Amino acid sequence: PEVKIKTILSLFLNINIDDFNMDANLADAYDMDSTELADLAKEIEKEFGISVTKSQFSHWETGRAVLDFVSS
Amino acid sequence: RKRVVVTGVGAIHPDGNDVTAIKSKVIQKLLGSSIIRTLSDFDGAKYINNRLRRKIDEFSVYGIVAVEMALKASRLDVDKLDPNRVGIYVGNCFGGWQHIEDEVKALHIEGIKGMGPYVATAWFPAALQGQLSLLYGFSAQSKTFSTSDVAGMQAIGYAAEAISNGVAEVMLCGASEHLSSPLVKNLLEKTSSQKHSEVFGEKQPGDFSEGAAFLVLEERQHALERGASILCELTGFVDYFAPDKNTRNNTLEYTAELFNHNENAVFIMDGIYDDEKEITSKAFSNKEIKTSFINLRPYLDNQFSVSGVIDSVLASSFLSENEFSNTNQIIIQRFSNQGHVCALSFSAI
Amino acid sequence: IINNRNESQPRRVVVTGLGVVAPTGVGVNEFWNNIHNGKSGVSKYEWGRERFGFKSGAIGQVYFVLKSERKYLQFALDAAEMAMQDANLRPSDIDGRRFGVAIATAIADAAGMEECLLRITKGGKENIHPDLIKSEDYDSFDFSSAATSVAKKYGASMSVSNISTGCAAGLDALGIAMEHIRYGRADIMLAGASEAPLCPLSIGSFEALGALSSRELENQQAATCPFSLERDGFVIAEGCGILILESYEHAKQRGAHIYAELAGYASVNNAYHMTDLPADGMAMARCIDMALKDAQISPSTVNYISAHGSSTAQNDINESNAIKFVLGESAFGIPINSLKSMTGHALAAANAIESVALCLEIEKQYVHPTINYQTPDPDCDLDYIPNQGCSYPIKTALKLSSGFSGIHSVIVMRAVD
Numbered sequence: 001p002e003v004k005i006k007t008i009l010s011l012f013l014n015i016n017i018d019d020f021n022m023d024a025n026l027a028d029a030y031d032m033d034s035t036e037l038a039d040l041a042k043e044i045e046k047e048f049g050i051s052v053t054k055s056q057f058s059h060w061e062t063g064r065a066v067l068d069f070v071s072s
Numbered sequence: 073r074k075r076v077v078v079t080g081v082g083a084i085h086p087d088g089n090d091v092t093a094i095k096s097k098v099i100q101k102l103l104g105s106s107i108i109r110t111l112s113d114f115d116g117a118k119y120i121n122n123r124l125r126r127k128i129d130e131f132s133v134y135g136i137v138a139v140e141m142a143l144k145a146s147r148l149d150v151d152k153l154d155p156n157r158v159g160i161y162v163g164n165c166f167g168g169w170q171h172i173e174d175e176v177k178a179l180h181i182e183g184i185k186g187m188g189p190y191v192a193t194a195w196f197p198a199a200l201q202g203q204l205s206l207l208y209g210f211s212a213q214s215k216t217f218s219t220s221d222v223a224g225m226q227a228i229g230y231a232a233e234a235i236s237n238g239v240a241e242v243m244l245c246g247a248s249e250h251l252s253s254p255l256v257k258n259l260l261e262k263t264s265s266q267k268h269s270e271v272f273g274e275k276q277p278g279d280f281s282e283g284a285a286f287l288v289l290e291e292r293q294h295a296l297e298r299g300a301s302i303l304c305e306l307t308g309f310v311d312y313f314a315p316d317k318n319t320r321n322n323t324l325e326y327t328a329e330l331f332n333h334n335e336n337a338v339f340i341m342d343g344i345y346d347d348e349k350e351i352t353s354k355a356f357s358n359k360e361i362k363t364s365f366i367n368l369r370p371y372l373d374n375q376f377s378v379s380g381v382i383d384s385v386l387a388s389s390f391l392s393e394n395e396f397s398n399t400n401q402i403i404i405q406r407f408s409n410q411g412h413v414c415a416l417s418f419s420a421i
Numbered sequence: 422i423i424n425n426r427n428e429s430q431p432r433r434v435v436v437t438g439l440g441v442v443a444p445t446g447v448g449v450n451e452f453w454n455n456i457h458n459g460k461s462g463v464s465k466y467e468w469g470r471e472r473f474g475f476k477s478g479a480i481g482q483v484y485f486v487l488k489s490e491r492k493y494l495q496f497a498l499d500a501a502e503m504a505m506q507d508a509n510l511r512p513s514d515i516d517g518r519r520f521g522v523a524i525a526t527a528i529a530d531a532a533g534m535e536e537c538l539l540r541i542t543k544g545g546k547e548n549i550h551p552d553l554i555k556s557e558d559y560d561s562f563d564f565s566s567a568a569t570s571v572a573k574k575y576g577a578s579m580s581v582s583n584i585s586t587g588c589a590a591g592l593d594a595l596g597i598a599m600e601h602i603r604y605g606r607a608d609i610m611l612a613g614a615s616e617a618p619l620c621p622l623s624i625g626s627f628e629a630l631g632a633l634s635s636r637e638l639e640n641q642q643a644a645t646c647p648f649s650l651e652r653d654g655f656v657i658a659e660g661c662g663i664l665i666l667e668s669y670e671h672a673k674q675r676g677a678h679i680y681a682e683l684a685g686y687a688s689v690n691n692a693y694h695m696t697d698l699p700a701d702g703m704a705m706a707r708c709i710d711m712a713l714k715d716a717q718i719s720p721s722t723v724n725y726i727s728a729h730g731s732s733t734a735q736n737d738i739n740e741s742n743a744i745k746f747v748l749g750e751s752a753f754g755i756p757i758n759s760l761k762s763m764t765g766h767a768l769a770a771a772n773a774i775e776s777v778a779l780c781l782e783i784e785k786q787y788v789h790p791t792i793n794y795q796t797p798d799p800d801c802d803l804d805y806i807p808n809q810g811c812s813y814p815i816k817t818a819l820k821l822s823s824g825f826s827g828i829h830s831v832i833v834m835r836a837v838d
């Protein structure tokens with residue numbers, strides 16, 4: 001679910017869960033880099049139990065973008 | 073050339089989590105199988121950000137908290153300092169095993185998926201140097217040494233040389249180590265005790281310790297202009313090597329020249345090897361020296377790169393004011409297994 | 422001083438001996454011949470893909486089960502032997518107290534430290550067994566194995582050190598070595614860097630980070646192609662480079678052959694990121710200025726640049742913008758190159774291998790090409806000497822370095838007369 005993802009990004013980026021908007025751009029809003037994106041992608045592989053290519057997680061610009069991915 | 077002074081110091085140890093608490097316990101102990109002592113009541117969330125800490129190792133953490141104390145002690149307004157004129161010197165031998173250990177093991181059982189993106193950044197010894205440059209924004213020449221035992225001693229020495237030649241006005245020099253992780257823990261508990269030096273001989277019985285220690289070295293005129301409280305002046309540095317026992321005695325006689333025939337001096341010794349007292353005294357006797365010997369190593373333990381630096385921060389504290397009183401020069405020495413001979417000289421004003 | 426005045430004034434530093442171990446060649450003769458022609462030293466490898474599931478297919482190797490080969494220390498002793506023979510010193514010339522060592526490294530014996538961990542834990546399945554930890558394992562955790570061993574062999578009683586600044590460690594070793602000679606501390610100085618990171622712990626750390634090249638290729642030598650659109654990262658390599666630095670005064674007395682002068686050195690922190698490099702290239706541009714000011718040479722004389730050129734997209738833009746910042750419109754006229762197109766990226770060793778190459782380039786008045794140059798990049802639009810090398814009158818040369826912790830390092834090299 002998104003509640004599961006929203007908690008991860010809240011802890012990873014050190015943001016308040018209530019303040020963190022899902023549709024906010026990760027790079028622009030929260031100063032997120034490609035290294036944090038790779039670390040985040042690892043946690044998605046760990047928890048949900050799926051495979052994520054570099055080409056796949058590269059397009060995760062938004063919090064809702066990773067939610068759309070993990071669903072499928 | 074230019075003159076270098078110590079304006080601030082800061083350190084953390086199993087004895088205490090600040091310079092005053094460590095110095096108090098050192099005096100108390102001085103007045104009246106190997107293990108790895110850890111920090112008591114330490115919490116790194118008290119200092120470092122949560123987003124940053126999850127990226128870095130404990131050795132980088134210990135270094136960051138050490139400089140914060142040292143900068144605070146020096147009373148530097150960081151916003152007023154030119155970042156182009158400030159550099160960072162670091163000593164570190166073992167790196168950051170705690171952060172990458174489980175991922176190294178996982179890479180064999182799982183595959184690539186076991187490993188994360190921070191293995192390269194966390195483990196290497198120059199990580200502390202970079203994290204400090206991101207936090208404070210310091211842009212001048214910044215080096216990291218990883219020479220066995222002497223890394224932190226070289227870090228201070230060559231930081232002073234950089235200030236002297238006019239590379240920077242201020243320097244954050246020091247060292248940090250983390251020895252608690254399973255790999256380095258079981259290694260030091262077994263192997264490190266029984267090892268012997270070809271040059272210096274057998275090791276004395278003793279424990280190991282982890283933590284960090286840092287100084288704020290700066291140019292003398294820069295300190296006097298801003299009205300800084302100078303602890304002591306860094307008057308000299310020695311960096312030599314002994315390939316064999318013949319050179320060993322001749323090398324120690326160069327450490328003797330660092331005294332400048334000063335009778336009112338205290339000599340802090342390495343305290344790792346048994347034969348140090350005999351060989352150093354024999355070399356010092358040839359050069360007409362009369363000085364007191366102090367061994368902090370049984371109290372402060374073997375901290376590798378930190379062991380040289382932790383003496384310097386304490387030496388700086390005494391000169392700014394049991395046995396250290398009525399002394400205007402504290403010389404410190406540090407050896408290695410392979411045969412390094414290194415020494416620093418701090419003098420009072 | 423009326424009678425025979427000689428001063429304690431800044432002395433000049435010169436390169437009298439070279440030693441190299443690299444994929445492109447072992448020794449000076451083999452190493453030069455291959456880079457002159459532009460032959461790649463990148464090997465196609467298999468165990469990375471099969472065993473650990475790496476996307477990497479290329480490595481720069483000099484010559485599946487884990488083995489403690491101890492290549493870090495081997496390449497240092499190999500290269501140090503070549504350099505000292507090339508220098509052709511004799512006991513008379515070598516004063517022990519004036520002879521120092523400075524061999525740098527980024528990861529040291531990581532291959533040794535990783536073999537130890539997995540052996541005692543039985544393939545990383547269980548907890549550590551204290552009994553399985555041998556006495557030999559402790560020596561793998563020594564970062565300065567190369568420095569101390571080389572020092573002991575040749576009787577270097579002056580400053581022995583190991584700088585661990587990652588990818589800029591090679592130049593920083595040459596930098597501190599240069600300072601020792603200039604300021605009357607040393608006459609001779611053995612300087613360089615050794616690296617052996619072709620092990621799963623190291624390749625994975627970079628593969629996980631995204632630093633390494635991962636695009637699918639048939640011609641795997643083209644994985645490392647600096648200043649091209651196709652580039653996606655560095656091809657990891659191993660090796661060692663060693664330079665025998667000594668004073669001009671000492672060199673001329675003994676009748677030593679001189680390759681080139683090591684004129685200046687500078688280093689900075691960009692304070693930007695730990696692995697990311699900024700497009701602006703301000704810090705690198707500033708570092709170039711300081712190295713030239715340290716050398717006391719004008720930027721007008723800069724005739725050739727040996728760039729870091731890792732083949733990561735970020736670094737090749739950083740360096741291109743940095744050279745344009747400091748040199749201006751003159752940057753387009755100046756030839757640039759990257760050895761990593763052939764030799765691969767050997768971390769700290771890359772700086773010392775390229776320094777050995779730079780000394781040979783200056784001596785023979787020839788510049789090696791940047792091979793595998795496919796499609797021009799809009800952002801990287803300087804002259805990179807694509808594919809074919811040529812004769813060129815090198816006057817003043819810059820060697821650029823970059824690394825993790827945002828460290829930039831430069832040296833100014835110069836022909837001797």
Ligand SMILES: *[PH](O)(O)OCC(C)(C)[C@@H](O)C(=O)NCCC(=O)NCCS[C@@H](O)CC(=O)/C=C(O)/C=C(O)/C=C(\O)CC(C)=O
Pocket residue numbers: 033034035172191192193195196527528531586587588589622623624626630631632696697698731732733734735736768823824825
């Ligand atoms: P996002 O997707 O934009 O990704 C970031 C990036 C990685 C692509 C970007 O940061 C980038 O492209 N950076 C370029 C880096 C570069 O070109 N620099 C040159 C090579 S760096 C050199 O300093 C290597 C180095 O310093 C390596 C170490 O210290 C190595 C280690 O720590 C390796 C280990 O520890 C492995 C081990 C034994 O544990």
